[PDB]
Amino acid sequence: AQKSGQLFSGLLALNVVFLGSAFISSMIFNHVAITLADVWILLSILKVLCLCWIIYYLLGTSRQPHAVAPVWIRGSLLLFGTFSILLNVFQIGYSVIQINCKSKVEIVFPSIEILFVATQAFFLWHHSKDCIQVQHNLTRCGLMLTIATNLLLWLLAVTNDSIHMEIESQLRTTTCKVFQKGYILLYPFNTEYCLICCSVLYVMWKNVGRFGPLLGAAAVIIGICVFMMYQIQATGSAPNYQVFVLYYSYYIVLLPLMCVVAIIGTIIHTLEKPTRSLDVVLLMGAALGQIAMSYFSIVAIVATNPRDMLNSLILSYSVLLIFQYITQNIFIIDGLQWKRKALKEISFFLVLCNIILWIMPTFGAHPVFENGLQKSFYGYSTWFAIVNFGLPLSVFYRMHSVGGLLEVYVS
Q: Which chain residues interact with ligand Y01 by CB under 6 A? A: 3, 6-7, 10, 13-14, 17, 21, 151, 155, 280, 284, 288, 333
Nearer to ligand Y01, 357 or 393 (CB): 393
> Segment near a second copy (CB under 8 A), from 25-33, 103-111, 172-180, 224-232?
25-33
C-alpha to C-alpha distance for 35 and 326, rounded to whole angstroms: 42
Nearer to ligand Y01, 141 or 352 (CB): 141
C-alpha to C-alpha distance for 242 and 282, rounded to whole angstroms: 36
Residue 311, class by beta-carbon neighbours within 10 Å (0-12 exposed, 13-18 middle, 19+ buried)?
middle
C-alpha to C-alpha distance for 12 and 340, rounded to whole angstroms: 50
Question: What x-and-dash track marks residues 132-171 binding a second copy by CB under 8 A?
Answer: ----------------------------------------
> Segment near a second copy (CB under 8 A), from 8-16, 148-156, 191-199, 253-261?
8-16
Helix intervals (H) in 207-274: 212-234, 242-271
What residue ranges in 76-201 does DSSP mark as E strands? none
Site for a second copy in 262-301 (CB under 8 A): 288, 291-292, 295-296, 298-300
| Residue 156 CB partners (closer than 8 Å, separation 6+) | 24, 39, 43
Residue 334 binds a second copy, judged by CB under 8 A: yes
The entry of ligand Y01, a second copy, none near residue 174 (CB within 5 to 8 angstroms by kind) is none
CB of 377 to a second copy, least distance (A): 5
| Residue 332 CB partners (closer than 8 Å, separation 6+) | 283, 401, 404, 405, 408
Q: Which residue is nearest to ligand Y01 (CB)?
A: 10
- Answer for which of 30, 103, 173, 277 binds a second copy (CB under 8 A) is 30
3-state DSSP of 289-320 = HHHHHHHHHHHHHHHCCCCCCCHHHHHHHHHH
Amino acid at 158: V
Residues that bind a second copy (CB under 8 A): 4, 7, 11, 14-15, 18-19, 21-23, 25-26, 29-30, 33-34, 288, 291-292, 295-296, 298-300, 303-304, 322, 326, 330, 333-334, 377-379, 382
